[PDB]
Design a protein around this ligand. Structure first.
Ligand SMILES: Nc1nc2c(ncn2[C@@H]2O[C@H](COP(=O)(O)OP(=O)(O)O)[C@@H](O)[C@H]2O)c(=O)[nH]1
Length: 180
């Protein structure tokens, strides 16, 4: 019955506190406050079952975390705009990991917490270390460097861009993929 469906797997990766779990809650429940959640979606006249995997709570557990990777069809690789360190960790931690366990899987680079670009309090905290909220050109530059399938920005808190994050991800998951 569900054996007639197209089944695909999405995994969300990124630093602790960068908004992975809130992003998935807003996708699944439509409200800003995980699981493995299966979302049923109709795409091009066909029923799709998208399984959603959160790596939150496993960022420090190097032997457990990669047990989320088998059979993955698309990766959401997240960083948060309130944290340049989370962006630097993309090429130096997350990409190496995902390329090793999920070779030839499309990677979408996702800037989370977009709304914090206009938070006075974040800006003041980051101004102490001579930093600023991660800007679009920087996230965009990172995506070209890691050869991402796409670069998208969202805010789980305002819901902006969340739909398109997962719509793009689902299209990437459904893309034909040859070799490993
Ligand atoms: N302002 C803002 N805060 C967010 C957003 N998404 C998550 N947060 C907050 O950032 C913190 C970490 O979010 P969480 O989803 O738990 O991060 P995770 O560790 O990567 O799963 C929490 O306090 C969230 O409430 C967002 O879009 N905007």
């Amino acid at each position: 019955y569900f054996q007639s469906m197209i089944r695909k797997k999405l995994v969300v990766v990124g630093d602790g506190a960068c908004g992975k779990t809130c992003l998935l809650i807003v996708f699944s429940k439509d409200e800003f406050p995980f699981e493995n959640y299966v979302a049923d979606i109709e795409v091009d006249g066909k029923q799709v079952e998208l399984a959603l995997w959160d790596t939150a709570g496993q960022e420090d557990y190097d032997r457990l975390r990669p047990l989320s990777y088998p059979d993955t069809d698309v990766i959401l690789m997240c960083f948060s705009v309130d944290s340049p360190d989370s962006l630097e960790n993309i090429p130096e931690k997350w990409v190496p990991e995902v390329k090793h366990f999920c070779p030839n899987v499309p990677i979408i680079l996702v800037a989370n917490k977009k709304d914090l670009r206009s938070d006075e309090h974040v800006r003041t905290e980051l101004a102490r270390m001579k930093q600023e909220p991660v800007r679009t050109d920087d996230g965009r530059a990172m995506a070209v460097r890691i050869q991402a399938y796409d670069y998208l920005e969202c805010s789980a808190k305002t819901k902006e861009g969340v739909r398109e994050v997962f719509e793009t991800a689902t299209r990437a998951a459904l893309q034909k993929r040859y070799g490993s």
